[PDB]
């Protein structure tokens, strides 16, 4: 943590391989105006003023996540390298037109971490283009005046993508570019999850992706964009296999 002026945050990293959250602190300076937006959120350029431990900011207590989902140790984490002092990165806030709940921010970040695991599994098949999903983290902006809630301003953060940002499929069956890898990845996740876990909303710059969406058959978890069986069917029905699907020996779909 740097002595330069900015604002403090409690920073949360989910680690799927131990299935726990890692709680840290950081300092950041975020530009006043967003540089981009989507349907539900605005994105802001931000600079990191360092990452620290959470020892100054005890929990007490019963908010989410529960204590048994929290790692008591935080020495290792991605944040300390990826959000080191001077890093430019992105902060995302929901637009008021506030169905956002605390739990929801953690679900979205966990989701992205789960997709990051699917990315690695895909890559281990040695496709022509490896993919990768960016880290994402929850941040409690503790210096800001609490919401109407009385519980702090929440946001999520992630590394800055540099380049032409494109969305390749939606979370409801749209195929928005001609690229193969994104669709073959979605398909891969559908077949290899035994249809239990489909990753769509494949978007980003080249093959560095962010803000995906998972569908699961029961619709539970993975945020509000989890359209369940319907999401899954809609993907698989508009999907036309390409060469990558074929290299991955996936069951051929004709669209
Ligand atoms: N990590 C990033 N780096 C750089 N630019 C980004 C990043 N994430 C998002 N953007 C840009 O910000 C816009 C809004 O992002 P995002 O909000 O994540 O997408 P979305 O699918 O519209 N759903 P929502 O999250 O509701 O907006 C995107 O369309 C991109 O132009
Ligand atoms: Zn396919």
Extents of the domains making up the chain: 1-162, 163-255
Task: Report which bound ligand comes closest to the CA of 184.
Answer: 2
Task: Report which bound ligand comes closest to the CA of 166.
Answer: 1
Distance, in Å, from the CA atom of 208 to the CA atom of 173, rounded to the nearest integer, reads 21
Ligand 1 pocket, residue 86 CB under 6 Å? no
Q: Report residues near ion ligand 2: CB below 5 Å.
A: 187, 241, 245, 250
CB 28 within 8 A of CB 46: yes
Residue with CA closest to ligand 1 atom 4: 161
Query: How do strand 208-209 and strand 132-133 relate by DSSP bridges?
Result: parallel
Architecture of domain 1-162: 2-Layer Sandwich (3.30)
Ligand 1 pocket, residue 104 CB under 6 Å? no
Residue with CA closest to ligand 1 atom 26: 40
Residue with CA closest to ligand 1 atom 18: 211
CB 13 within 8 A of CB 67: no
Pick 163-255's CATH classification: 3.40.1410.10, 3.90.1150.10, 3.40.640.10, 3.20.200.10: 3.20.200.10
The dihedrals phi and psi of 159, each to the nearest 5 degrees, come to -60, 155
Radius of gyration from C-alpha coordinates of the chain: 19
Residue with CA closest to ligand 1 atom 6: 161
Distance, in Å, from the CA atom of 174 to the CA atom of 31, rounded to the nearest integer, reads 33
Distance, in Å, from the CA atom of 143 to the CA atom of 163, rounded to the nearest integer, reads 32
Which residue blocks in 97-195 are alpha helix, DSSP H?
A: 102-123, 181-192
Helix or strand or coil: residue 1? coil
* Assigned token pair, 109: 């970040």
Q: Could you report how far apart the first and last alpha carbons of the chain are, in Å?
A: 52
Ligand 1 pocket, residue 39 CB under 6 Å? yes
Helix (H) / strand (E) element for 84: namely none
Distance, in Å, from the CA atom of 120 to the CA atom of 132, rounded to the nearest integer, reads 7
Ligand 1 pocket, residue 174 CB under 6 Å? no
Q: Looking at the chain, which runs of residues are DSSP E strands?
A: 7-15, 20-30, 36-37, 41-53, 88-94, 132-133, 137-141, 153-159, 166-167, 198-200, 203-205, 208-209, 213-215
Distance, in Å, from the CA atom of 137 to the CA atom of 123, rounded to the nearest integer, reads 23
In Å, the largest CA–CA distance within the chain is 59
Ligand 1 pocket, residue 165 CB under 6 Å? yes
């Amino acid at each position: 943590i740097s002595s330069e002026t900015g604002e403090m945050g409690i920073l949360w990293e989910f680690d799927p391989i131990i299935n726990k959250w890692i709680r840290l602190s950081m300092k950041l300076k975020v530009e006043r105006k967003p540089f981009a937006e989507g349907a539900l959120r605005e994105a802001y350029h931000t600079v990191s003023l360092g990452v620290g431990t959470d020892e100054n900011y005890p929990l007490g207590t019963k908010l989410f996540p529960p204590i048994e989902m929290i790692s008591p140790i935080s020495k290792n984490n991605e944040a300390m390298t990826q959000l080191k002092n001077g890093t430019k990165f992105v902060l995302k806030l929901y637009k008021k037109e506030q169905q956002a709940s605390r739990e929801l921010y953690f679900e979205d970040v966990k989701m992205q971490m789960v997709c990051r695991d699917w990315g690695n599994k895909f890559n281990q098949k040695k496709p022509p283009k490896k993919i990768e999903f960016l880290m994402s983290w929850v941040v409690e902006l503790i210096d800001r005046s609490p919401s109407s809630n009385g519980q702090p301003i929440l946001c999520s953060i992630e590394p800055l993508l540099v380049g032409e940002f494109k969305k390749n499929n939606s979370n409801y069956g749209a195929v928005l570019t001609n690229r193969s890898t994104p669709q073959a990845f979605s398909h891969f996740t559908y077949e290899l999850s035994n249809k239990q876990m489909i990753v769509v909303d494949i978007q980003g710059v080249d093959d560095l992706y962010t803000d995906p969406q998972i569908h699961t058959p029961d619709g539970k978890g993975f945020g509000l964009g989890n359209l369940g069986k319907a999401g899954i069917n809609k993907f698989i029905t508009t999907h036309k296999c390409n060469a990558v699907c074929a290299l991955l020996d996936l069951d051929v779909k004709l669209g």
